Structures are given as structure tokens and as C-alpha cells.
């Protein structure tokens, strides 16, 4: 028991440190976006603010550097707890520490401070290097969701051997809120991606690659339209203008099924609609068959009267009524065949009841 209360304590610590880490990552993104705004719209006479922002981003990513260490050290401590280790060198596995040091390098990425009013070369890509830390988001999605923490879930999942993982929580949030996930994805892409492309290309003299051009360029590449009014010039802009259309194909292809799911009836609604169409078509067959006799006796009346042109007019409408009646009867028979096929699994369970009554 002693390693179990300790386990829950450490897991709560891990959730809290995932919260702080997500907050400090979003803060670093907010620093980089406004730094990129203020360098262009501020000019070269506000360099003191840029200096202080670069020091802020450096301390801001130093904190995330401490936090990832604190996270994965607790994860290792969990793993030692689950197996009763004491030698911490042993549990530090090769692929495990490889992923950890790789994450250290990937979140070691930052626009480091270097120093007639324009940029250097590397410090633009180093500014781009912030949004490569967006992988921490599903980690916080996992830990802030308490389904891993809630014990009854774990009990039933251990009974059915289903292994709660990231793929489980993803399908959980997907099939509990099918609209919200797709909306939060597409609406998160549609503008932010274009801001990133504005970082990727900048012209100094003409100002022909900033926000108001890429914010129109990237939804057009996303929706696979491709006018040609704005075109990326550098190669790094060309890469983003491939990834944009990739994500657009992805969002289109996920949206189409979300549209298609809500269209069909409920299983219960189908019986109701079919039963209503039954009593509609029954009365309609009575209607058409009445039109048959109504025209038939009129043609026979003008036959007994030997009215030539009246019979010539009537018998055409007679045959037309016959043609209508045949199609109505065929629709009724098709729907009745659907009924006898809509009582396939229904009559199966009915004779499952009658099979308990055959066991009785």
C-alpha cells in the first residue's frame, strides 16, 4: 500500500508540474509573437525593449528547462517505484534517456540574443524555433484529465485488458465531443500558420511579405485554391506552403465524415418513418385505385353512349392512370420488402425471446 499512496502523490505532483509547464510554454509563445510584432512596428529606436524581451525569453526557457527535468525525474521515480528499484542508474534506460536528452535539445531552442535597422541571419530561424515545443500539449491533456487518476476506470480496464494510453484519451475526447475537437483544430490553424509564414519571409524595402500577405496566402493554400496573387520567394517559405496544403487536406478529409455522420436517422426513427410511409402509401393506393374506377366508369359511360371523341380522350387517361398505379404499387411493395428486411435483426431478437420461450 505504501507505494500506492506515494504513487498517487507523485502523480498529482506530475499533473501540477504539467500545468505550470503548459503555462510557461504559452508564455514563451506570447513573448515570441509580440517580440516579432514590436521589432517590425517599432523600428530601430526601441532597442532597450528588445534587449529586455530577449533576457525575458532566456529566463522563460530556463524555467522550462528546469521543469522538464523535474517532470521526467518524477516519471523515473514512478518507474522505480513500480518495480522496487533503488539504483537510479539502472532505470535510466537508453531509449528513455535518449528521448529525455532529445527533448532537452528540442526545448533548448530559443531566439538567443546576438546584439541600418534590420535583422541578422540566424536569429529569425531561432525565433522560429519556439513553436517546435508544441508537443507538450497532449501531455497536459493526458495528465489534467483525471481518467488516469480515477480508479474505477483502471479497474474495469484491467478487467478487459485495454491499457489506458494516449490513443485512449484521444478517442475519448474525440467521440465524446466530435464537433469541438475538429473546430478547435481548424480554428487554431487558420491564422496562426500564416503568422508563422510571415516570420519565414520578410522584405525590407517593399514590405511585401508581412502579416497582411501571408494571412491571405495560407488559407488559400490550405483550401487548395492557389490563386497566385502572393507567392513565396525563399525556399523556407516554399516548405511552409507545402505543409499548409497538407494540413488543409487533413482538415477537409476529417470534416467530410463529421458532416456525414449526423445525417442518417436513429435506429428508432427509421421504424417510425417507415410506419408513417406505410399508412401514407396505403391511402395513396386507395387514391390511385379510385382514380382507376372513376375513369373506368366514365369511359364505359361514354362507351354506352358511343361518344367517339370522349372515348378517345378518356382511354388515354385510363392508361395513364394504370401507369401511375403500377409505379405506386411497386413503391409500396419495395417499402414492404424493406419492412420485412427491417424485421431482420428485430425478428432475430423476437425469436431470441421466443427461443427463451423455446428453452421454456
Amino acid at each position: 500500500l505504501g507505494a500506492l499512496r506515494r504513487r498517487k502523490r507523485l502523480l498529482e505532483q506530475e499533473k501540477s508540474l504539467a500545468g505550470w509547464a503548459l503555462v510557461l510554454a504559452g508564455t514563451g509563445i506570447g513573448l515570441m509573437v509580440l517580440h516579432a510584432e514590436m521589432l517590425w512596428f517599432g523600428g530601430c529606436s526601441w532597442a532597450l525593449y528588445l534587449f529586455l524581451v530577449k533576457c525575458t525569453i532566456s529566463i522563460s526557457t530556463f524555467l522550462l528547462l528546469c521543469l522538464i527535468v523535474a517532470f521526467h525525474a518524477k516519471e523515473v521515480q514512478l518507474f522505480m517505484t513500480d518495480n522496487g528499484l533503488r539504483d537510479w542508474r539502472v532505470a535510466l534506460t537508453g531509449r528513455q534517456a535518449a528521448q529525455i536528452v532529445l527533448e532537452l535539445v528540442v526545448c533548448g531552442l530559443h531566439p538567443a540574443p546576438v546584439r541600418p535597422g534590420f535583422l541578422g541571419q540566424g536569429e529569425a530561424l531561432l525565433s522560429l524555433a519556439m513553436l517546435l515545443r508544441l508537443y507538450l500539449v497532449p501531455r497536459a491533456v493526458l495528465l489534467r484529465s483525471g481518467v488516469l487518476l480515477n480508479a474505477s476506470y483502471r479497474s474495469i480496464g484491467a478487467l478487459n485488458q485495454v491499457r489506458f494510453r494516449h490513443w485512449f484519451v484521444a478517442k475519448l475526447y474525440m467521440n465524446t465531443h466530435p464537433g469541438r475537437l475538429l473546430l478547435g483544430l481548424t480554428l487554431g490553424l487558420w491564422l496562426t500558420t500564416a503568422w508563422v509564414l510571415s516570420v519565414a519571409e520578410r522584405q525590407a524595402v517593399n514590405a511585401t511579405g508581412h502579416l497582411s500577405d501571408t494571412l491571405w496566402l495560407i488559407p488559400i493554400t490550405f483550401l487548395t485554391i492557389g490563386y497566385g496573387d502572393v507567392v513565396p520567394g525563399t525556399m523556407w517559405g516554399k516548405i511552409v506552403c507545402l505543409c499548409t496544403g497538407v494540413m488543409g487536406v487533413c482538415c477537409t478529409a476529417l470534416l467530410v465524415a463529421v458532416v456525414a455522420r449526423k445525417l442518417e436517422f436513429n435506429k428508432a426513427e427509421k421504424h417510425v418513418h417507415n410506419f408513417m410511409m406505410d399508412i401514407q402509401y396505403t391511402k395513396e393506393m386507395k387514391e390511385s385505385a379510385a382514380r382507376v374506377l372513376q375513369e373506368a366508369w366514365m369511359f364505359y359511360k361514354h362507351t354506352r353512349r358511343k361518344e367517339s371523341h370522349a372515348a378517345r380522350r378518356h382511354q388515354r387517361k385510363l392508361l395513364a392512370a394504370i401507369n401511375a398505379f403500377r409505379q405506386v404499387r411497386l413503391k409500396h411493395r419495395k417499402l414492404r420488402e424493406q419492412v420485412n428486411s427491417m424485421v431482420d435483426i428485430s425478428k432475430m431478437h423476437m425469436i431470441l425471446y421466443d427461443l427463451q420461450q423455446n428453452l421454456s
Binding site: 393506393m285 386507395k286 387514391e287 385505385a289 379510385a290 382514380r291 382507376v292 374506377l293 372513376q294 373506368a296 366508369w297 364505359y300 362507351t303 354506352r304 394504370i322 401507369n323 398505379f325 403500377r326 404499387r329
Partner: protein, 146 residues
Amino acid sequence: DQLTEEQIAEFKEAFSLFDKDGDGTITTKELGTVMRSLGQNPTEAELQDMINEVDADGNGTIDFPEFLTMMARKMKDTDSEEEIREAFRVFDKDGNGYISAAELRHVMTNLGEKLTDEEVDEMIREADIDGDGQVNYEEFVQMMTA
């Protein structure tokens, strides 16, 4: 008969598709086997009823000369015989084998456009050429072919 030899031959294999055993005729069980092979399940009573629809000699078994008369109605597009017959079947709400004047007033007066009962009485009077007080199926068929 009037049919040419090639056409006689091509109807012969179609007849052979019913006489799967080559018994010289068509039986009930053979036909029900075909019905099951095409994905529908009648009863013996339903099979016998469709025999009674088609059995001219009254044997319960079908031969090729009956089969030609059978397919003569089916080869065309609109089986006007069948269309009048099943419309008659709609009319016999009680299953009497008849159309009464009460069934006639139930159908034609209210549903349709307001045909007067005295005109419906003249219709029933010219209709019951058998004098049955009501419409048979033979009276109905002769009536629609009048």
C-alpha cells in the same frame, strides 16, 4: 404453332430452368426451390396459391404449353391483367371475393371526386350482369373488359 424454331428452342432452356430435374413438368417443390434461391420465402400455401393463379388444366403441375401462355403475359411490359386483378384485390377489404355497394360507397363517394350514389346505383346495376347484387371477380374482369 406460330412460334419459330429458334424461339421455341430459346424458350425451351427457360422452361428447363424451371424443370431442373427434367421431370417433364414443373412441381411445387421445384418452384419453391427457385423461390428460395432467389431470396424470398413463401409458404406451401403461397406456392399453391400462385399455382392456382396459373394452373389452367387443374393438375397442380405445369407443362410447357401452359408455360407459353404464362410467359405470354410476362414477356410484355405492363401486365394489364395483373394490374386490374390486384387493384380488385385492394377493393375486397373483407376478402369476400366480391365488391359490395357498401365497399363501393366506402371507396368512391368520399375518396375521389363526389360521385353521386344514384349514378353509383346505375353503375352497380349495369355492373351486376350476373345479377349477384355485387361484383364478382369474373364480373369485375368482364366489366373492365367491357
